[PDB]
Amino acid sequence: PQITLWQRPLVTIKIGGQLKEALLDTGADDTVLEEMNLPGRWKPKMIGGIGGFIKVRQYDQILIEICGHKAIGTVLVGPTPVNIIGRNLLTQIGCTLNF
Amino acid sequence: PQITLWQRPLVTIKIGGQLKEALLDTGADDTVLEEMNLPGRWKPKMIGGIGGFIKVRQYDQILIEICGHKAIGTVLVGPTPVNIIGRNLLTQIGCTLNF
Numbered sequence: 001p002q003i004t005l006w007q008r009p010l011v012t013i014k015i016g017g018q019l020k021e022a023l024l025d026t027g028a029d030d031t032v033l034e035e036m037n038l039p040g041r042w043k044p045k046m047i048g049g050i051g052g053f054i055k056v057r058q059y060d061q062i063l064i065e066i067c068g069h070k071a072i073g074t075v076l077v078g079p080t081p082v083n084i085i086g087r088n089l090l091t092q093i094g095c096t097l098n099f
Numbered sequence: 100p101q102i103t104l105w106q107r108p109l110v111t112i113k114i115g116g117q118l119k120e121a122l123l124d125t126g127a128d129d130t131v132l133e134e135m136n137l138p139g140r141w142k143p144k145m146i147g148g149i150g151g152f153i154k155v156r157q158y159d160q161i162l163i164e165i166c167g168h169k170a171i172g173t174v175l176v177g178p179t180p181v182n183i184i185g186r187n188l189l190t191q192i193g194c195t196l197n198f
């Protein structure tokens with residue numbers, strides 16, 4: 001699809017057997033999801049944003065279906081206020097900015 | 100232009116007679132710039148992000164040239180780690196996501 005930005009660019013994702021909504025975020029290098037139950041090994045990471053830093057769990061080679069497109073990559077899980085799809089996954093679904 | 104997301108989507112902006120780089124950010128509702136010198140009245144605001152909340156100065160009807168496109172709107176000035184162009188200005192330059 002083409003998505004205009006009069007509203008937040010939210011899409012449906014499927015990850016770890018669960019349905020969620022997430023924001024297509026061109027200002028996010030990485031993908032950060034709210035606390036959820038993901039299987040397997042994970043590594044501690046700290047990421048920074050507007051008001052400081054949060055601790056996240058880093059999960060690698062995670063399958064995510066983003067608006068019906070499959071991608072595999074790193075997902076960070078932790079206290080983000082909203083689910084963010086970052087450029088690590090936006091590049092895999094062929095997402096571009098146009099003006 | 101069309102912009103792919105293999106790198107951060109940075110553009111040149113001109114605001115208050117100054118040249119800066121800023122990130123085209125679809126995950127930002129509002130435009131947040133690092134401390135800079137802007138003329139005129141401003142109102143205190145608090146905005147939240149990944150690691151908490153920051154205090155910003157809200158400036159209304161501010162002219163910004165974003166990659167050679169003129170827009171006028173609200174700009175927030177405060178301790179953001181990076182200059183962010185949010186959807187309040189991305190809609191004015193006709194910016195879309197496509198995949």
Ligand SMILES: CC(C)CN(C[C@@H](O)[C@H](Cc1cccc(F)c1)NC(=O)O[C@H]1[C@H]2CO[C@H]3OC[C@@H]1[C@H]3C2)S(=O)(=O)c1ccc2nc(NC(C)C)oc2c1
Nearest residue numbers: 025027028029030049050081126127128129146147148149
């Ligand atoms: C600040 C910006 C440079 C990066 N951020 C992405 C940005 O789009 C971020 C996404 C977001 C949205 C809503 C709530 C949030 F907590 C976070 N937006 C953001 O800070 O916007 C704030 C401000 C903008 O205007 C309004 O719209 C949303 C609120 C509100 C105030 S981030 O902090 O969420 C972020 C996301 C993914 C990241 N991956 C990394 N990886 C590093 C290791 C490089 O860093 C990340 C940092």
